[PDB]
Amino acid sequence: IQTQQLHAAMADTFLEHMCRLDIDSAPITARNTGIICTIGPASRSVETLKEMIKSGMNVARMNFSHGTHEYHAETIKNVRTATESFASDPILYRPVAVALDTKGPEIRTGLIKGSGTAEVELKKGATLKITLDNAYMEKCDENILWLDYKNICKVVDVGSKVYVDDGLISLQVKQKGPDFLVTEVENGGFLGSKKGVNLPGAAVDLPAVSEKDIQDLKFGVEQDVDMVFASFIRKAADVHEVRKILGEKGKNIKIISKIENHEGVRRFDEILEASDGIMVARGDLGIEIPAEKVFLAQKMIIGRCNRAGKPVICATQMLESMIKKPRPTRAEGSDVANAVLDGADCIMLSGETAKGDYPLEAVRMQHLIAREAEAAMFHRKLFEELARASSHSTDLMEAMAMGSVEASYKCLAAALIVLTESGRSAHQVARYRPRAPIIAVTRNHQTARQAHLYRGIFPVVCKDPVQEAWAEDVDLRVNLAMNVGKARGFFKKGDVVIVLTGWRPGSGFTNTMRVVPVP
Amino acid sequence: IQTQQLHAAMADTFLEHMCRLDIDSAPITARNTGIICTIGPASRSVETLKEMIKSGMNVARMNFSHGTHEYHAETIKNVRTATESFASDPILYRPVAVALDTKGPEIRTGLIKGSGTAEVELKKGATLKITLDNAYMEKCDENILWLDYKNICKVVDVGSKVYVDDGLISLQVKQKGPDFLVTEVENGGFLGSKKGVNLPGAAVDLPAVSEKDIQDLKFGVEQDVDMVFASFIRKAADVHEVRKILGEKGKNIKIISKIENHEGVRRFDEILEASDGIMVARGDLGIEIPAEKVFLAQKMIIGRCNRAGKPVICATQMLESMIKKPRPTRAEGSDVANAVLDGADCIMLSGETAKGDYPLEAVRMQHLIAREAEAAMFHRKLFEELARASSHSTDLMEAMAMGSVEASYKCLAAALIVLTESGRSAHQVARYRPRAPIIAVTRNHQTARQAHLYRGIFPVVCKDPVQEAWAEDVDLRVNLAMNVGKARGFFKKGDVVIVLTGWRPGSGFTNTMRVVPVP
Amino acid sequence: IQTQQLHAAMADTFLEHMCRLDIDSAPITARNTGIICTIGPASRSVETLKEMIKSGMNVARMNFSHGTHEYHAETIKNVRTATESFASDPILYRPVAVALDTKGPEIRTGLIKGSGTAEVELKKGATLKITLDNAYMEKCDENILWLDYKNICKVVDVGSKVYVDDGLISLQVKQKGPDFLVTEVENGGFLGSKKGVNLPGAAVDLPAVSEKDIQDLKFGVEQDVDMVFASFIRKAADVHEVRKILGEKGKNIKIISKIENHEGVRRFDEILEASDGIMVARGDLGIEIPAEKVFLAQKMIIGRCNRAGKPVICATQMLESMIKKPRPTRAEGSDVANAVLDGADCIMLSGETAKGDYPLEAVRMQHLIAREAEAAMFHRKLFEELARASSHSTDLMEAMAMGSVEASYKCLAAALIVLTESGRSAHQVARYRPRAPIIAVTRNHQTARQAHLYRGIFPVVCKDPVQEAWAEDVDLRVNLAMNVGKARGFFKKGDVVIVLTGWRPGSGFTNTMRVVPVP
Numbered sequence A, B, C: 001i002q003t004q005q006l007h008a009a010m011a012d013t014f015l016e017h018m019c020r021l022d023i024d025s026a027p028i029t030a031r032n033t034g035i036i037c038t039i040g041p042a043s044r045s046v047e048t049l050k051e052m053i054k055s056g057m058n059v060a061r062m063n064f065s066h067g068t069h070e071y072h073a074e075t076i077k078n079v080r081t082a083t084e085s086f087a088s089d090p091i092l093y094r095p096v097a098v099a100l101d102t103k104g105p106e107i108r109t110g111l112i113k114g115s116g117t118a119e120v121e122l123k124k125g126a127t128l129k130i131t132l133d134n135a136y137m138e139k140c141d142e143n144i145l146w147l148d149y150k151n152i153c154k155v156v157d158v159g160s161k162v163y164v165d166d167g168l169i170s171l172q173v174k175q176k177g178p179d180f181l182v183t184e185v186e187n188g189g190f191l192g193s194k195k196g197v198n199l200p201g202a203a204v205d206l207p208a209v210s211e212k213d214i215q216d217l218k219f220g221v222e223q224d225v226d227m228v229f230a231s232f233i234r235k236a237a238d239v240h241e242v243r244k245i246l247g248e249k250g251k252n253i254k255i256i257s258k259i260e261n262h263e264g265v266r267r268f269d270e271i272l273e274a275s276d277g278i279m280v281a282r283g284d285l286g287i288e289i290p291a292e293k294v295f296l297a298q299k300m301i302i303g304r305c306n307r308a309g310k311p312v313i314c315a316t317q318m319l320e321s322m323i324k325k326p327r328p329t330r331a332e333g334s335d336v337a338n339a340v341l342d343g344a345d346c347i348m349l350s351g352e353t354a355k356g357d358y359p360l361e362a363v364r365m366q367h368l369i370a371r372e373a374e375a376a377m378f379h380r381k382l383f384e385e386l387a388r389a390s391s392h393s394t395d396l397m398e399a400m401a402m403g404s405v406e407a408s409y410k411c412l413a414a415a416l417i418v419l420t421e422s423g424r425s426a427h428q429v430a431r432y433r434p435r436a437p438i439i440a441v442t443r444n445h446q447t448a449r450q451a452h453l454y455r456g457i458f459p460v461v462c463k464d465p466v467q468e469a470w471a472e473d474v475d476l477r478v479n480l481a482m483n484v485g486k487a488r489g490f491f492k493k494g495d496v497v498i499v500l501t502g503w504r505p506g507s508g509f510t511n512t513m514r515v516v517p518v519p
C-alpha cells in the first residue's frame, strides 16, 4: 500500500481516482491547509495559545462582533506572547497571523429580562412585539424584543420573515408600525440575549463600513494586524470603502471579503477582484439564502478563487459539536475533508476554539483531516484544469511556478523551497497546487505571516542579516529551509527537493529552479 | 438563469462546472436520492408515518440492535398501515420498503446504578474496572462496568484502548485479568446505560451471525422484509452465512452489507460481489478507524459501488443536530449534499427520525438538499467515466440503458419510463445516472419496493390485471406512468419522455426505446 | 489573428482545435522537423549542397543501394566541404549529419537488352520467364528477366505474386523450375534496368546483413558517418547483427531500423528497443503489405516512437511529383503536413533531391509545410497524453524536461536553450514536444550532428575552449545560443527564454532551469 493516496493519483478518471482511495495509505507529515482559530475565553490564555500553535493554529481570529478594544488588545498581546515564546529557535519558530473580523452592518437583539433564564421562550404560534425603543434595550420579554436596527420598519412589510439567533427562530411580521412591529412566532425556541437577526430578502440599508467599524479598523492598523475579514461585503464598492479606512498605513493589510448575503454571491466577481481573498461565511449565508443551497455557493466561490489565484476560506460550524464533545460528528468530519477537497486554502474554527470545551482537540482534528484530505486530491486533473483555466496568461513567474509544480509531481519531490520577500513567488507556486509542502523563506515578517492564507505555503523567517555575497545569502536561506524541513519531519537527507530562487538580489520573481538533494 | 444547474452541465472542466453552480438555478421536482428513515418512538405512530411518507420517506429501517420482536412487529405493522392508507389511488400510492438492520457481533455495556442519573461520570484520569460477571449486569458504577463480550480478555492486552458510547469515551487497559480488566479513563464523560463498545485493532471473535441474529433474520423473512442491513460484515464469508439463514424463502431479500470495521474496508471487493448493496456505516467505522479517514472510505466505497452498479447507502449523523433543533448545522447541510455528489444511491436518517424532536423536518431537509445536490452533479463527465469503467462489458440491457440515458441528456427528457417486472431494466438505467427521474412501472410489489435502493428510480405499481393484447398492456402501463408523472409534477403535456419496454411479454430486458410526447 | 495557431492551441477539444486552424495565423521562423535529403546526381555539387544547407537540409542520406564506395566517398567529401564552407562564423554554421543507407537483403533485376529502350514492354497477359542464369544478367528481354536472388525458387510456389519496380508491375508464377520461373504479366508496363523486386508473403531467406553490407558498414565507420539507416530490419536480431559490424569503433553511430516488410511491423517493439530510431520506409512497405494499410503502420510507428522517446522518420514519395515539377500535388502537400502532425521527428526527400529537376524547391517546400504544420499541433493534449504515457518513469531529467516544456508553454517562451554534451538533456526536452525551438549548445560535434534526429532541436557547436570558471563557461555557451537565436530570427532582445544547464562541469543532466530575458 503506497502512501499519499498515490495509487489513486495515477487514476485516469475521477471515478477511478475515487475508487482507489485507500484508508491504509498514510498521508505525509506536512499539512497544507491553513487553520484559522477564533480566540476567546476558552483560548485567551498564553499557555493555551502556545498549545494551540503546537497543535496547528496558523491564524488567530479576533471577532469584533463582541468585546472591547481593551479586550482584543490583550488577546492580540497574548497570541503574540505565545508566538514569540518559540521565537528562540528560528527553525522551530512558527509565524502566526493576526486577523481582525469586522462586526459589519449586522442586526442584534438586546438583553433579556435577566431573571427569566437570560433566555425567554417564544412558543410556536405566540405573538411577539419587536421594538426599537432603547428603553427595553436590556429588558427583552416573550412579548417585548428590542433590536439595534432602527430602520427595520423602513424595509420590512407585513408578511416578511425576520430570523433570530442563527436563523433557528423565525418570525412573521403580522402588523407594521412606526417604530415597532408585531409578529407571530413561527419557529419556537429559547431566545438568548443580544442574538443576531437576519432579514433575508430585504434591502437592509446599514452601511458597509459602520461608525464602529471605522474605529475597529483604525485600531487594527495601529495594532498591526495582518488581515481584515470584512463582514457582509455585498459589492466591490464596500471592499473599497474598507481599503480606504485602512488607508496608506494599513496599505499592506490583506482584505478578505466575507460572502454572507445573497447580493455578495450575486456580485461575487467584482468583489473578488477588489479583494485579496475571500471567506465563505457559511453562517449568515445559510440564513440569507436557503440552507440547502449554501454548498452551491461554497464550491462556486472556492472554484472561482482557485481559478483566480486568490486565497479562499471555508468557515463556520465545521466541527461544531466539538464545542461540547471531544469527537466530531461524521458529517463534521466529512465537511472538513470536502472543504479541503473543494480547494479551500484555509479552514476555520470559531466557537469550537473561542468558547468550547475542546479548543485543542478541535484544532488537532482539523489538522488530521486536512492532511488526510489533501493526499486524496486528484492533483493531475486539478493541475491540468488549473492550467487550462489560465492559459491566456503568459506570466513569467506563473511559468516558473507551473514548471516547478510539474517537475515536483514527476520526481515526487519532498518539498519546494521558495526564497521570496514579497511572497508573490510562493503564492504563485501555491496557485498550481503542488502535492508537496512549499517552504517559503523570507526576511519579511508580515510576508511570512500572511503566507498562511495560501494553501501549502509553510513560512519560515530568516533572521540572519543579509550576507555580502548574493550566492552565499541564497545558500544561507536555502539551508535554513533544509533544516526546518528536516526538523519538522518533512524530509530527511537524500530526498529530492525543488528550489526556486532569484537571479540577483531583489529579483522580480524566482526565475531559477533546480532539483537538489537534501543535505 | 437556467435550471437544474444546466449552465454548469455544459462545463468542459470540473473547475468550470464548479464555478458555474448557480444558487438561483431552480432544481426539478423529482428527488432521485432514496431516503431511509429509522423508525422509533418519535415515528412509531401511523399518523406520523403517513406524514413521513408525504415528506419523502422511501425505506423504513428497523434497528434490531434494540427492541423486541413484538416491538418491531408492530412498527412494521404501522408503517404498512400508513403506507396502504394511500393504496387507494394507484397514481398517488408510494411503495415503502421495510428494512431489517441486524444487531450484529456488537459489544455493549450493562445498565447503570439507576439513582446515579442512569449516567455515571468517569473523570479524566480515574480508574475503571471492567467486569464480565453478570451480577453487575444492571449495576454499573464509576468503578464497575459490565459488558456483554465474554472473551474480551482473550483479545485485549495491557495498553490497548477500549472505547465506549460512540467512541466519545476512551479507556486504556492498565491491567489484565481472568474475567475482568482494570483501566484508566482517558476521555472523561457521563457514561450511559447499555452503550456500544469498540475494540479498534483487536481480533474480536464474535460470530458474523450471532444466535439472536439468526432469530431476527428468520423473523424478517416471516415478516416479509424487503432487505437486510447486515452489521459488521468483515468478509464475503459473513455475507454468505447471512444469505444462508435467509434461505430459500428469504431468497429475494436484498442483502446490504454494512462496512463498519477496518477489515470490511480492507476486504471490501469480495464483500461487494457477495452482496446486493452496501452501506457506509460511518458510525462504527468512525470508531474502528481514525475519524479523519472515514471520508476516504466513503468516497472509495461509493465510487466502487457506482462502478459495480450495486446500491450504496451513506449513513449516520448526517443531520444529527436536528435531533434537538429544527435546522441542521452548516456541516450537516454540506454532508448530505456531498454524499449525493459522491454518488450515494440512498442517504439515511437514524435518530434524527427514530427519537429526535423533528423527524418530519429532518426528512424534509434531506429531500431538499438531495434535489439541490442532484442537479449539481457533473452528469456528462460522470456518464463518460461510468462508461469507460464498464467498457469490457457488452451487455444488451446495458447498451439499451446507456443509449437511453444518452438520448435523455441530449433532448433533456422529462423522465424515462421503464416497464420492468424484475427491475433489472430500471436498475441498469439507474446505473448510468440519467439526470431525469426514472419511472419504473411494475406489477411486482416487492420489486417496486426494493427499487428505492437505486438512485433515480421512482417505483409505480400497476394494479390493473394483465391485458389480453401485449401492445395494449404496454400502453396501459405507460399511461399509468404518464399520469403519475403529470400528477407528481414531474412533467406536463407536451414534454418529451424516453420509454423503455420489452418486445414480447416476459422479455429478458427492455430492448425497445422511443422518444414520446407527454399526452 | 494571433500567430502560431495559438487560438487553436487554446481549444478544449480536437474538433475545436481543428475548427480554429487559421490560414492567416503566421507560423514562427524556427522549423522543428528535421529534413533528410538523399544526395545524388542532382545534388552532388558542392555549390548545390551549399544551397541545400541554406534551404534547410539537416541530414545527407547516402543510399548504398547504388553507387561505389569511391562514389559515396566523394559525395560525403562534398557535403562536408559544403558544410564547413560556413564553418567560419560559429553563429551561422549549421551542422549537417551524414547518414549511410544500407542496401539490405534486397532483390533486383538485371540490365535490359540495351537497344530496346533500356526498357522492355511487358504486355498485360503476356508470358515472362524469370531466370537466375548470370548469362542474361545484362540482357533482359520481354521474355527473359534475370534477378539477383538465387534462392527465389526455394520460396515461391506456383500462383504466388512477384512484383517489380516499386510494385508497379506484378507477375504471377504460372510454373515452377530448378533455376527459372515462367510467369504471366498481370500489370503491364515498361520494365527498366536493375529494378527492385518484391516477394510479399514469402519467406525471403536473404541475410539481414549481407556480405556487401558488411563492407559498406565498415566503410561508413571509417568515413565517420553519424547514423545508419538499416534496410529491411525484420527483428531485434537483425539490429544487433548490424550494431555488431559497426563494432567498438562505430560504437556511437546511431542505428535507425527501417520498417519495410510485414514482419518488421509485426515485430516492431523488439526492433524499437534494439534500435536508436526508426524509419517508416513507405516505399517497400507499400509493396510488402497492402498500400491502403501503410498509413496504419505509419501512425502506429510514429505513435509508438513518440511514446518511447526514440527518433522516427517518415520517408519516400512525399513530394514525388516535384522530381519533374516545381510545385507539389495537393496530396503531397498534405502528406508532409500530416507526417509532421503525426509526430514524425524527421521527413525525407529521396529522388526529389537525388535526381529530380528541383532539389532546392523540394527542400524549401518541406521546410515551409513543416513550419506550418508544427504550429498546427495540439500541443496541450499532446503533452498531456505524452505525460500519461510515461507516468511510470520518475527520471530526474525527464522531470526537468517536462517542467521546462510546461513552463515554456505557459509564458510562451521564445526558445529553450539546453547546454548538453551527450545530448541526452536536449533529447529529453524534445521528447515532450515544446512548441518553441530547442537550441542545444554542445562542444561535441557528433552530438550536434546527430541532434537533428530529434524534433525541435536546433544544434549549435561551441568552438571556444573550455573556460576556467564553470559559471563563466556556462554564460559563454548560453550567450552563443542567445546570438544564434537573435541572428537566426528566432527571437530578439526582450523576449523570454527558458535555459537548462548543469550544476557542475560534466553533470549527469541539466538539473537547473531558469526563465531569462534575451539580452
Ligand SMILES: [K+]
Pocket (backbone or CB within 6 Å): A063, A064, A065, A101, A102, A103, A104, A231
Ligand atoms: K463579525
Ligand SMILES: [K+]
Pocket (backbone or CB within 6 Å): B063, B064, B065, B101, B102, B103, B104, B231
Ligand atoms: K444495528
Ligand SMILES: [K+]
Pocket (backbone or CB within 6 Å): C063, C064, C065, C101, C102, C103, C104, C231
Ligand atoms: K537502400
Ligand SMILES: [Mn+2]
Pocket (backbone or CB within 6 Å): A231, A260, A281, A283, A284
Ligand atoms: Mn457573520
Ligand SMILES: [Mn+2]
Pocket (backbone or CB within 6 Å): B231, B260, B281, B283, B284
Ligand atoms: Mn453499527
Ligand SMILES: [Mn+2]
Pocket (backbone or CB within 6 Å): C231, C260, C281, C283, C284
Ligand atoms: Mn528500401
